[PDB]
Structures are given as C-alpha cells and as structure tokens.
Design a protein around this nucleic acid. Structure first.
Ligand code: NA
Length: 143
DNA sequence: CCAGCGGCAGC
DNA sequence: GCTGCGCGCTGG
C-alpha cells in the first residue's frame, strides 16, 4: 500500500521521478519559467553529473551554472540547487516548501506524487491541475 | 524575423 | 504587493 501515483495521459515528468523526492523537486526547479521541452533534456544531463543531493550539495555552483546555461536563470538556479540540496539533506523538514528554492508549485508536486496527500492539494500550475483534476475524476476507478 | 513568455526568494 | 533573474520556444 505504498503510494504509487498513477501514470496519466499527460505524462508529467513527476510521474517518473516520484521514487526520489530530491530528483522530483530538482525537476520542479528546472521547470521554473522554463518550457519542459528545454528543461527536461537538460535535467537528464544534470542528473548524470549530479545524481544525488549528497553530491549536489558539494558542487561548485559556477559549474552547475555552466550546465544550466541554455535554460536561462542559470546563476540563480545553480545557487538555488546547491543550497536546496544542502537543506534537503541536513534540515529536518516535513514538506519541501520549508526548503530554499521550493515554493507552492514544488510543494504541491511533492504532496501529489511523493506522498498520498493529493486530495488536500489545490494546485495553481496548469499541468498539475490537469493531472490533479484527472485524479479526482478517476480515483474511484483506480482505487 | 520578432516580441511574448514559459517559480521563487527577498525586499 | 513588487522586482530580478534569462534562455529558447513559439505564433504570426
Ligand atoms: Na521554500
């Protein structure tokens, strides 16, 4: 009875990343004011070089920024990713909105995909809303 | 060819 | 409430 969020016709990247809350949350950061068409290909390159919060928190942010260059917001998000990964591992938190760089959208993603709290979430992100409305409409069918 | 636009911190 | 951050996709 582990929480496994169902695959949707929308194929949000969160659907494949929920096993690793850090990776899911990094994905939300990559999608800040960035089309998924650009962000997600670069996300795989980032995760090949920085596969865990454990190593990402030790990274030189200037190296992360180089990798993020084609996405825009590269210095901002490089610094965010290092600090976020540090807090992810060393701060006691219940919801990741408590962590630097995660706001309502990343937190809503976590509460739908990483824990079984989707019924309490009220997303404002259009992609999250499509998944969330679809869950509400189909949850009794999927049990 | 070109302007609009796809979260979060912090003040 | 507001601003800084930034690239490339996209519609026409
Ligand atoms: Na936060």
């Amino acid at each position: 009875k582990k929480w496994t969020p169902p695959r949707s016709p929308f194929n949000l990247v969160q659907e494949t990343l929920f096993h690793d809350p850090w990776k899911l949350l990094i994905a939300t950061i990559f999608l800040n004011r960035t089309s998924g068409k650009m962000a997600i290909p670069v996300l795989w390159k980032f995760l090949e070089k920085y596969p865990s919060a454990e190593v990402a928190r030790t990274a030189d942010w200037r190296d992360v920024s180089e990798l993020l260059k084609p996405l825009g917001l590269y210095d901002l998000r490089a610094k965010t990713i290092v600090k976020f990964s540090d807090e992810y591992l060393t701060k006691q938190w219940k919801y990741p909105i408590e962590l630097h760089g995660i706001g309502k959208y990343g937190n809503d993603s976590y509460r739908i995909f990483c824990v079984n709290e989707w019924k309490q979430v009220h997303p404002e992100d259009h992609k999250l809303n499509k998944y969330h409305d679809w869950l509400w409409e189909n949850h009794e069918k999927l049990s």
